[PDB]
Every structure is written in C-alpha cells, then in structure tokens.
Ligand binder design. Structure first.
Ligand code: NAD
Ligand code: NAD
Ligand code: NAD
Ligand code: NAD
Lengths: 404, 404, 404, 404
C-alpha cells in the first residue's frame, strides 16, 4: 500500500518481484538492471524505504548511514555478506534473504552431469571438437542400476535422491544427523561404507569448519575404483590437488566441479585450475542455482518477506534480527525496536493502561542488545496516533511504527 | 556341444557371449578384440563353423564363398547390411542379429544431453577450460515444465518420453503412423505445430528415402526460436549446413549430434564437420548404443540364437531364412535346406517310410524360393546317419544336418 | 519432570502415551484400563494435575470444580464434547485432543468393505455358517472399473479416493466447498448426478444440522439400482427406516454401517436395529478408528501436548484456550492466566521493572474474555519464586505458574 | 463363417461369447441358460458341430458317441474333467478350456478378506447381527506396514503381490521354482522363514501330490502367533482339523477359506464344516473366480479358441491333443488327424507331389497314438477339393478337412 513508500530494486531483480510488490499496492519502485555506482547508489538509497539488491552491491556502514528512511533490506540471493548486518541491526533494519530458494536447479544439474559423466561424454565431445573420433564402449555405463552416494541429506540431497530413483538408481546417504529417508533412500552409518560402495558421489553439505577439505586424499582413496565425484555445494569441501592425483591415476573416471576455492569476482577475470588439464571433467562457473526459474521464485520469496514486514511486523527468517510474528486479527498494530534493558516494556505498556486501552495481543523477542515487540490494541485511529508519539519518547527507543 | 566346432568372433564381442558359448559346451573359440582384414579374415573363417561379427566386418559373397564350414552368421548389433544376405541364404546359411537391443542407452543419453543443453553447460565448460568464467545465467532453464517434441514415437521415442515425464516435462509427438500414446503424451497433427511449439526437439525415426534430410532449412525455421535440437538416430536425417546457419543466427540455442552423414571408418581417422566451431553443440562418436549393459545384452542375445540353431535348428528371428522352430522332445533330429520345388518333401519323407521309420514331428516353412524343414524321427544313430546320407542326395538339396 | 505431579489416565489410553510421560520424567501415573464412575472419579481426580480421558468419561462443571490440582485436560480422541469446555477455560485449564488422528483406518475399512459387498461375501458367509451353499455368482462384480461416489471430499474422502484409484476404480466426489481434486477425481455439480451415476456411495461428511438425515428416502432413490451404500461417518446422516425399505425392495444390493443414530453405552448393552435382519449388510460397533496404529499415534500425540504445556506453557492446538508458544531459550519461565481487562499486563511487567529485572521475551494472546501470557526473565529461582507470589495477587488473576 | 455350421452353447455361457462367434460369421447358435436333460442333450448334440459347456454337463462316451458332426469341445471354465477327454481325442475332437481366465477376481477377493480379517470385522459383524455390541481395539491392525506371505507365486500370487503393495504391505513369497519378483516382492528360501515372519499367509498353489495337506499342524504351528491364513486355491492344501485347533487355541486370529475338501454338488445341498463354529472365519462357497467380469473374458477366450481352430487348424492350448499352429499366409489350408504310424505322412505328401502341386508350409506334431498335421498348398479351389477326397482314403485317417 501507500504510493509514498519507495522501493529501490537493484542488480536486475526478477520481474516477478515487481509484480508481487505492485499487487500489494507498493507502486513506488526504482528499477536498475545493474549495480549502481557508489555515488548514485547513495543518491538512490537516501530517500529509499526498502532496498532490494543481489550480491554485487556492497552495502557498507557509510552507505547504510546514507539512507535515512531505510526500513528493511532484501537480499535477492542466498549469500548475505555484502551488507553490514549488525550496522543495519543497530539502526533497526532487518535483513532478509532467500536461503533454500534454488534446489530443483542444483538437482537438475547433478542428474544431468552424472548421466553424461558415466558415459564419457565430456571427453568424447572435447575430442570430437578437436577433430578426433574416439568411439569406445570400454567404460560407459547406464545410470539404471547404479548406486548414488549423497553426503548431506538436506534440501538438495532429498530432491536429487528422488529424481535419481526415477532414472533407476539406488540412493544411499550420509548425514551428520539422522534423517527420514524419502522414497527408498538408505541411510549409511559410516562415510567409509558410503564411499566404498558408491559409483557416483555427490556433496550437498554446508560451508563450515567440519566440512573444510572434508573430501581429501584419504576419503577419495576410499571411493571404489572407477567412480565419479560431483561437487556442487561449496568450494571448500574438496581437496583439489588430491582430486587431481586420483584423476591422473585413473582412480576416478571423471568428476564435475561447480564451485571452487577461489572464484573470479567477475566474468572479466580469468579462471585458473589444475582441473583444466582433464577432458573427463566438467568445469562450471558456479551455476546450478543460476537458472531463470530460480531467479523467479527468489524474487517472489524475498519481495514477499519485505511486504509482510512492511504490512504486519513479521521478522521470521530475518538474518540479523530477533524473530517475531503475530497472527493478525483485530485492528491497530504498532511495533517497537529498542535497547534491551529493564523497564522499557513496562513504560510501553503503561501508555495504554493509563488511557484505558486494551492490549489484544503482544509479542516481544529479544537479541543481545536489542528488543523488538509487536503490539495489538483494541483502539481507534486517533488513540493509535497518540500512543505512537508517546512510544517514540520512551528512553531506549530506536524505532516505532503504526502498521495499521 | 562340440570340441571341434570352430567359433570365429571378431570386433570385440562382449565377454558374456564368450561365456554363454562355453556354457553350451562350445569351447573352440577364436576371439579377436578388433577387426580382421580380408586377407586374414579368409584364413580364419575357412574352417570356421560360426562367426560373430559387428558393424565393421564385411561378409561379401566372395568371403561367404570362401567359408567352407560356415553354418550360421551372427551379427552382434542391430545393423545387418554389412553381410550379403542373399549370398548367405543361397548356401543355407541364416543370419541373426539383435533387433532392438539398446533403447535405454539412447534414452538416458538424450535425457542427460537436453538437461545440460537447456542450461548452457556445453559452452560454459568449453570456455572454462580456456580460462574463461561465464556466469551468464539468463538463458539457463529448468527441464521441469518444458515441452519435448519427439519426432518418431517408436521404441526409443516411447522410452525417452517416459523418462522426460519423470523430470516434469511435457511430451508431444509427431509420428507418421497414428499410435497409442503411453503416459500423458499428445500426438500432434502436423510437424509445423510441434516444431513451433517445442522447447527441445529430438529425432527417433528410421533411415529411408522418406526421412532423408527431413529437418531441412525450412523445418529448422518452424522451430521455436531459442530451442534445442537433438539427433541420435541416423546421419542422413538433418541438413547440417542448415543447422550451422541456425546456430550462428541464434535461432537455435544449442544442439547435440551423435550420428553424422559421413562418419570416420575407425578411431584413427580424422573427424571433420562445421559443427566443431560451435561450443554450444555436443558432438559424440556414434555412441548412445555403446554401453556395457547394452553390449552385454546383445552378447547374450545373439550367442543364444546361435546355440539354439546349432542344437536344434531353430531359425526364429533370422532375417534371411524361413522361420521354423520345433518343440524339443524325443530322439533324433535332422534338418534339410533345399530349393522350393514340388516333390522334394515327399521324397524326403519316403526315405523313412520305406524303412518303416516313424516320424514323430515335422515343420516345413518355405521362403520365396527356398524351403527349410526339420524332422523328429523315432530311430537311432545308425539309421539316422544312414538317413542323413540319402537326404543329401536329393534333387535340389542345399544342406542336411543331424542335430542330435 | 516431577515425582509428585499426578497423572490420571482413564479409559485405557495406549501404552505409548504411558511410555512418553515417563520419558519426560513423569512417573506418578494412575492408570485405568476402563472408565471410572462419578463417585470414584472424584476421589482420583482430586489431587491429580493432569487427566487423560476418552469418549466415555464426562467432565462436567461439577467434576471440574472438584478437581483442585487440575492443570490441563487431555482428550485421547477426536471428540471433545464429553467435557465442559467453558467450565475449564474459566479455571485456566486448557483442553487438548487429537484432531485428525485416524483417517487411514477408516480408509482401509471402506476399501475392504466395498470389495466384499460388491462380491456378495457378507450374505454368502451368513448362509454358509447356517449350512447353506450359495454359489449365485450373477451379482458378483470386480472393483476395477467401477465408480466410487464420495460425498464429502475431506480428510478421509481424499484418502479413500487414493486407495480406490489403486484398485482401478473411478472416483467422483460431491462436496459443498469446491475443492482441488487429488488424483483423477472428478467433482460432481449435483448429488443427483453422483447418486444416479455411482456404483458404491460412501459418506465422509461432518455432523451438523446440515448433514442430519442427508440420505433421505429420496436420495436413496436417486441411487443407481443395485448399488451399495457405506456410512462410516456419523450416525445421524442416514435415514435408516428408508435404508431398510431400499434393501428389502432390492433397489440396493447391500450396505455397510459403522455409526448408528443411537449407539450402546457400553459393550454390555443390547444392540438393536432393523438392519440386523439383512445378511447383505455389514454392521460394525463404531470401529474403523479403533486400530492399534491409530491408538498408538493418538497416545503419542496428546501426551506430547500435555508435556509441552507442563514444561513450557505451549497451548497451541488447544480448543478452549488462546494459542501461545514461545521459543525455549534462556532461564526462568513463568505464565499467567487472567481476565482480559485493561491494565493487567502493565502491572505484571512492573513487578520486574521496579526490581530491575530484564525481560528477555514475552507472548500475550487473548481470548474473548481471557488472556494468556508467558514470560522469559533473566533472574534466578529466588526472584522468580518471589515474583510468582506477586503475580498471583493481581486484580483478575486466574492462575500463575513457574515453568522453570 | 458358414451359416451351416452349428454351435451349441449350454449352461448360461456369457453373452460376450455369442458376440464373438457372430462377429466371425458363425451365426448358427443354439443357446441354453442351463444344463440340458440327457435326452435332449443328445438331441441337441447329434447334429452339432461345436459344443460349449461349463461344468454341470457331463460329456461321457455314449454322449460323445451321439454327436456325429462334432468338431471341437469348448470348456467355458478351467475345470475340464466333466468330459471324456481321450474318448474325444480318439474321435479327433480337441478339448479347449480357459485356465488362467479369472485371476483379478481371486486377488480382489483375498485383498478384501485380509483387510477385514485383520480388523476383526467378520466377528464384530456376526455379533452385531446377533444383537451384541462388541467394540474393541485390542487386536485390530491396519494393513499398511504388514507382511504378506504368498505360497505359490504364479498367475494369482503376482497380482495379489502387486495390489498388496498399493495398500502399503511388504510381500514375500515362496515357490518350488525360482521366480522373478515383481515390484518389490521378496523371494524367501525356506517355508519356515516365510511362516515365521508373515502376518497373513495366502496359498495360490496347484492341486497335486506334493501340495496335499501341505499346510498341516507343523506348518501352522510355525506361523507367528496372531497371524491369519487365507486359502482360496484348492481344498486339499490345508489340514482342516489342524486349522480348527490353532483357531480354537488362538494361535491364529482368524482365517478365510473359499475351497474345501468336499464341496456340495449343488446349492440345494447342505454345507457342513468344523469351521462353522468360528465367527472369526469367513466361509465362502467356492467363489473368488465367480465374478461377472471373469465369466466375460472366459467367454471371449474359449469362443476364440474354437473360432481359431475352426478357421485355421490351431490346436495350441488344446487339452487332449497335440499342439500345432501355422502362421497363415497363402491360400489353401487342409488338415489331417490320423493314427501315429509309419508311411502315413509320405502317402499324404505323395498326393500333391504326383499332381505337381507345391507345399508351401507343413506342421506335424504327434501324440501317443495319433498325429495331427496342418498343410498349406499353392493350389486352386478345385485341386484342393480333389486332394481332400484322396486324403480321406489314406489308411489311418480319422479326419481330414479343407480350412480355406
Ligand atoms: N552450486 C550452487 O550454485 C549452489 C546453490 C545452492 C546451494 N548450494 C549449496 O548446497 C549445500 C547444501 O544446500 P542445502 O540447501 O540442501 O542445505 P541443507 O542445509 O538443507 O542441508 C545440508 C545437509 O548437510 C548435512 N550435514 C552437515 N554437515 C554434514 C557433514 N559434516 N557430514 C554429513 N552431513 C552433513 C546437514 O545435516 C543437512 O541435512 C550448501 O552448501 C549450499 O550452499 C550450492
Ligand atoms: N545413435 C545411435 O547409436 C542409435 C542407436 C540405436 C538406434 N538408432 C536409431 O534410432 C532410430 C529409431 O529407433 P527405434 O527403434 O526407436 O525406431 P522404431 O523403428 O522402433 O520407430 C521409429 C518411428 O519413426 C516413425 N516414422 C517413420 N517415418 C517417419 C517420418 N517420416 N516422420 C515421422 N515419424 C516417422 C515410425 O512410424 C516409427 O514409429 C532408428 O531409426 C535408428 O536410426 C541409432
Ligand atoms: N466411524 C468412525 O469411527 C469415524 C472415525 C473418524 C471420523 N469419523 C467421521 O468422518 C467424517 C469425515 O471426517 P474427515 O476428517 O474426513 O472430515 P473433514 O471434516 O476433514 O471433511 C468433511 C467434508 O465434508 C464436506 N461437507 C460438509 N457438509 C457437506 C454436505 N452437506 N454435503 C456434502 N459435503 C459436505 C466438507 O466440505 C468437508 O470437505 C467426520 O464428520 C466424522 O463423522 C467417524
Ligand atoms: N478359489 C477359486 O475359485 C480359484 C479360482 C481360480 C484358480 N484357483 C487356484 O489357484 C491356484 C493357483 O492358480 P494360478 O492360476 O496362479 O496357478 P499357477 O500354476 O500360475 O501358479 C502356481 C504356482 O505354484 C507354484 N508351486 C507349485 N507347487 C508349489 C509348492 N509345492 N510350493 C511352493 N510353490 C509351488 C508354481 O511354481 C506356480 O508359480 C490353483 O490351484 C488354482 O486352481 C482357485
């Protein structure tokens, strides 16, 4: 609602987001197919109420300190570190993102790559292009009947497991946590067991200390001879050098790598990797999530999070903020962001008590140094307007707002 | 089961065939991982009873006539034009093959190929291997929800369709013979409709003057712009120079070709084609049938056809012989190939009648000008052997054999 | 987890509930395989904190008022009318139940019942047990290809339909609320269409003045002659005298009834009905929900709802209480039931403010005239206990409790 | 074809058979909804060419000796001993039947019965009718998750296994021969293993010496406590007395028996069995195959066998005759039934040889004392007529005919 509230979408955000916003009434949108030049980024953001960015723009302290009307930040991507999170929190600005927004894509990528990798297609094709005809049946196999090994049975591991069974494979998995096997997937106790019996292994694990170079010389040496390895999760999980030695020594028949340890910051930067020596290797520029339909639902999701926040104070899934949401029912909803310390809430509640106003529902969640609270009151437009002015005066206040 | 019934196997027939011959008590096996030149082929095939060959060996009337102990020919492939059928039938030598022995392989290939072509993976991998990062995710799409146009709803079309459906795609087919759609397939009335409607077009039609250059420059046009073309049928179906123009003009996003008009005689031959210049085009050396599983099955199929003929004159799936098979029950089995003229059978039966030998079963099937008959008689080895001799001396007798 | 927090369980609640209470450190359990009469119920429920009851125990205001230590009520069934909801809410006592805990059971029952009814098995078994052989196979039919008319496409309808589809039947449904058909289900516009079209008619609609005597003598008529009727919903939906006329007139081939208008108070009571005379009618004692698996799950569900409230005041699925739940993180949790009048919350918060006690989280949800709030405070047992005392002395305080 | 050829359908043969016949041109049909009185049976059969019966009429020697124009006998049922098989063979009359003609029915019966048996429905219903209300959950279970045990994995065992998996069960099986498990059925090595782990056991074994009282005291005592046994195969496989003791001692929760050791010869005869004392037992009058759709395809099948025989000499599946069939192609087909002895065939072939006629194809199969042979000749209507007259004169001839 309100044609007065400005939204600044940047970096070629999907059209579906612009439609969502507009359906909500938010029609003051400033679009930009690319990242803005620092000088105009500030010129655009200062008067902006909401900023929708991707991953190229870096919203740092003095940039955030440049936007005086900023209410919320929407990250149209999973990555969320191109922004001063706590500098935003400190100003009462929640950051939203789209985490599990592109799983079908990553799974479609892996199924496809394993089919052809198992067929020697990347090499035969590399050669065909170079003028050599290399027709061999020698070590080509059908996917049907093979055992897939998933490490990290989360959002993607599941999908891949489902699709794979359609192609006639036997999926097994390994997770640090016990999971509920979908379809006929079979959880394996020790990694070694997995590694020992899997024809093609795929990693769908998160980035953190325990997964750092998870797959190294030892683990790879455990994989049955002639197996394939597909890494489309995080570029820090596989020991590349160790991976080159197995490839070089024919321990592995081939592999697919979509994420590397250090990736070029732009398409204008040169890619470089030992993996370039191998024809039996599919090197991809960190895509897999990069599909038109993914961008499509990423847009819908995060424009949605921004809308809900705008309309009813919901901070669920917020990256740098305490999480609250309240089942809307009844007129008059206000919100308060403040310093987490004694007596703030009491003074907040007093305003209504002393006005004989009834509080219908109230939710308060607190972080380290800040507290957020959504309040519902059985009152009229005027009384609401009143209490608001008062709310703002409570020592500790950072932000207060009347949602409806 | 015989110690001196020589088996000549060339062109590296799968180990499972070798294995099954021995199981049938057939030991004398002269194996050859590769092809054998005419001069050498002759010395080998001379005292050979059976020969298993593939797409490269050429059994010309000359060679067939040089084969003295040649009883049956076995083609471990779906193609059979490499041997002079007529020059073989005339000598009472039937030829067997593996009719539809590798459909799942071509099906798996195309599924995997389209998935990656839709995603721009062939071109990305090309540049990445040349130190080029290319994250242009604009043209990347997901298979789910797309339309697969299958031209030729045959053994492979119906298979490709089923898998395509599992990935969430929509299948439409155009066939010359109105057929029963399996799954949610929809038969299209015209090529124009399908071409103008499909996202991915795959050909699976037979080779013949009707399909020669089917996909001409006009058909390529009728295709939805930005679409993909995949051809894993026969090299004569697509007009390649037209194909190349379409690619350079961007009317098509990519393609995957496995069968070419002119193909290399062997792997040591130079492969040349204009398609080599396009990175967004998957070129493969007529594989897609070349799969261990398919080879194993072909090996198991054709060898079994050889035994069954050797042990009990069954010529069921023969492509040049009359098809006869008789239930194996009772002692003494003989067979007789001969010219299809009146009187030969009466004179054959008479041999036993005047000897007061009771005939238990008899099956005679006749070719255009040939006749094949197999008889079960209630007698013993002596009468049998003696009766064999007589049969060989009948007007128009091409062959006679004591199966047991 | 407490040694003297008495749990009163009656009417034979499944062993899995007993098992889960103990797991939650709850030992004091007074179990009863059967029901307890009012006089005896009172002596037991007096010093009891929690009570788990089923369809037979009647918690009337009188009993509720006799319950002194009663903190929460748990209905191990889908029905909840056996307890005075209002007399419970007024005392800050919420009631839980198992909303949709046995749909697969009713689904399995009807599948099995129709299969046999279609085949004349109920009548045949009747006569056979009376020394009568009855091979009249004329009216026997196969389920495959038949039409199943589902009146009430709800939780059970959608389940019954899925199974029906697996047997090869055709499903059609008539609902009051236009809904999304799962599987190949077809929504019918009118009852007349469905009734006149279906082979087997099954009811799965809720009880209310709208469904009372739905299947009147007229509807029974609109049914295809020779059809079958199956009712495993509620006893008021079908006009039984009409039903009986239809059966005797042969307009209907058979029926299966599980729920009756008037049902026996207990198993020692006489069951009477006109349907008893028909052999082609399957009569069952309101079973179809009575399945070990369903009982196990209900036992596991409701007990868990009791723990969660006991250990952390969550009242999520309560049917009489405001629904509040707060993420369990941090020390000191209290809760407070009270009248929904202005000022009570401010006075509650003040207690901590003036004490310089920092409130970490707070959720207040309000009922029509009641209010429930649960608070997390950063203090210790002393302040907590001392703070509890104060809260109990607030104007309109119904209850207060120190959860941890 | 030929309105001159008479068909006598008896015992209420399905209308679908009458349609089939008529579509073939055979329009001379004498129908009878019931078994004929011996006197008129002979009056009807004497001039009849084909007889279609079920299982009530007994075609004995003097009855067969009464039909002078009888060509073939069609048994519209699986049972085939109400006919003098070898007395028919001796006269050159083949007998056909419909063996695997009613499997879906038997499977639908078993699924249905096991669902309800597992629920205690047969008893609860038996009681409901007698006026007692016995609502218990005590030992009622859902089919979902249970293990089914099939003994005899043939035509029915397979179907049942498939349907059962749809209901969510785990099917295991035991066969005297190694079979190929459909879906996810699991073959078990020893009966004991099966018996030990199966909740409900179903027998789909054939009648013969090794299956006589197959399931006795020992086998039953091996079944896990509280299991169910369903026998819908042959009444000689289960030791009834032993079955009564397990039921009586609660070793088994219930059972379903459709076939007994001695069954009443007509519905007017009293059924008597110890199994009548148990409510937890479903007694059925040997139905399961007795469904309208079964009768429907039985009719289509056997009227089809009679037609093919009539039209082209095919005796495949013939019960009392040597089996022959010849791929029709080319005009002029004749047939010959004779004494199996030397020189008959030679003399048969001479007729054509001496007339300069070419024999296109010939199939001869022989039994103990008789031989059947189908012949194809490249000749004209007249020459055919000629040879026929001659064929009839060959000593040993029993029957000869010109098919077309
Ligand atoms: N290549 C791409 O463009 C791309 C796109 C999207 C996501 N991803 C990556 O895929 C990975 C998985 O993504 P998701 O969304 O399915 O995440 P997820 O968090 O849902 O699942 C991760 C799984 O890993 C399991 N786990 C954690 N550590 C493990 C270990 N040490 N050993 C075994 N199991 C382990 C977890 O228990 C969990 O089930 C993430 O790293 C994500 O960044 C890559
Ligand atoms: N690339 C490989 O290694 C490889 C392997 C196996 C088979 N093949 C090819 O696969 C092709 C199809 O094989 P299959 O066994 O599925 O074929 P098939 O012979 O079973 O069916 C082919 C279908 O094409 C249809 N058709 C014929 N002419 C057509 C036309 N002009 N337009 C549209 N439809 C037409 C036919 O009606 C038939 O339904 C074969 O012709 C062969 O070229 C190639
Ligand atoms: N026999 C048993 O032991 C037993 C066990 C469980 C539930 N029940 C019964 O099952 C019934 C259905 O249960 P459920 O959970 O599937 O129901 P539900 O409440 O999930 O859905 C019932 C459906 O009936 C539809 N409807 C309402 N009035 C209708 C009308 N007048 N005409 C047509 N459709 C109408 C509603 O729109 C709804 O879709 C319950 O009402 C209850 O009576 C009985
Ligand atoms: N109740 C009815 O009205 C009715 C109707 C039709 C058929 N039947 C009966 O069902 C039975 C099976 O019928 P089908 O048509 O599936 O037959 P089938 O012959 O196809 O299968 C029988 C199976 O039993 C297996 N087998 C044989 N002896 C066995 C043993 N000793 N132990 C383990 N396995 C054994 C066989 O190998 C075979 O797979 C037959 O007796 C048939 O008469 C009953």
């Amino acid at each position: 609602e309100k044609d007065k509230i400005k939204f600044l979408l940047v970096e070629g955000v999907h059209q579906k987001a612009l439609e969502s916003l507009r359906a909500a009434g938010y029609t003051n949108i400033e679009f930009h197919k690319g990242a803005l030049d620092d000088e105009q980024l500030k010129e655009s953001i200062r008067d902006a109420h909401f900023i929708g960015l991707r991953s190229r723009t870096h919203l740092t302290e003095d940039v955030i300190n440049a936007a005086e009307k900023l209410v919320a930040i929407g990250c149209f991507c999973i990555g969320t570190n191109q922004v001063d999170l706590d500098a935003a929190a400190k100003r009462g600005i929640p950051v939203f993102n789209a985490p599990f927004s592109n799983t079908r894509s990553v799974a479609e990528l892996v199924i496809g790559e394993l089919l052809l990798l198992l067929r020697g297609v990347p090499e035969a094709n590399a050669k065909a292009h170079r003028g050599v005809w290399n027709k061999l049946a020698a070590g080509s196999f059908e996917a049907r009947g093979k055992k897939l090994g998933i490490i990290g049975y989360g959002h993607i591991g599941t999908q891949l497991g489902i699709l794979a069974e359609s192609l006639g494979m036997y999926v097994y998995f390994y997770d640090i946590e016990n999971k509920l096997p979908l379809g006929n997937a079979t959880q394996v106790q020790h990694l070694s067991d997995l590694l020992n019996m899997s024809d093609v292994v795929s990693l769908h694990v998160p980035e953190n200390p325990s997964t750092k170079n998870m797959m190294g010389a030892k683990e790879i040496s455990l994989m049955k001879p002639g197996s394939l390895l597909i890494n489309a999760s995080r570029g820090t999980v596989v020991d590349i050098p160790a991976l080159c030695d197995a490839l070089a020594s024919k321990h592995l028949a081939g592999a697919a790598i979509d994420v590397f340890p250090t990736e070029p910051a732009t398409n204008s930067d040169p890619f470089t990797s030992p993996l370039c020596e191998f024809d039996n290797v599919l090197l991809t520029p960190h895509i897999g999530g990069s599909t038109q339909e993914a961008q499509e639902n990423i847009g819908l999701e995060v424009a949605g999070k921004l809308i809900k926040y705008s309309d009813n104070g919901s901070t669920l899934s917020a990256v740098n903020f305490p999480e609250v949401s309240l089942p809307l029912h009844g007129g008059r909803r206000l919100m308060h962001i403040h310093e987490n310390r004694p007596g703030v809430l009491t003074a907040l509640n007093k305003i209504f008590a002393e006005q004989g106003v009834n509080i219908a529902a109230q939710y308060l969640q607190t972080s380290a140094q800040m507290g957020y609270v959504v309040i519902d009151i059985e009152a009229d437009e005027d009384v609401a307007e009143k209490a608001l002015q008062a709310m703002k005066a409570i020592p500790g206040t950072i932000r207060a707002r009347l949602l409806y």
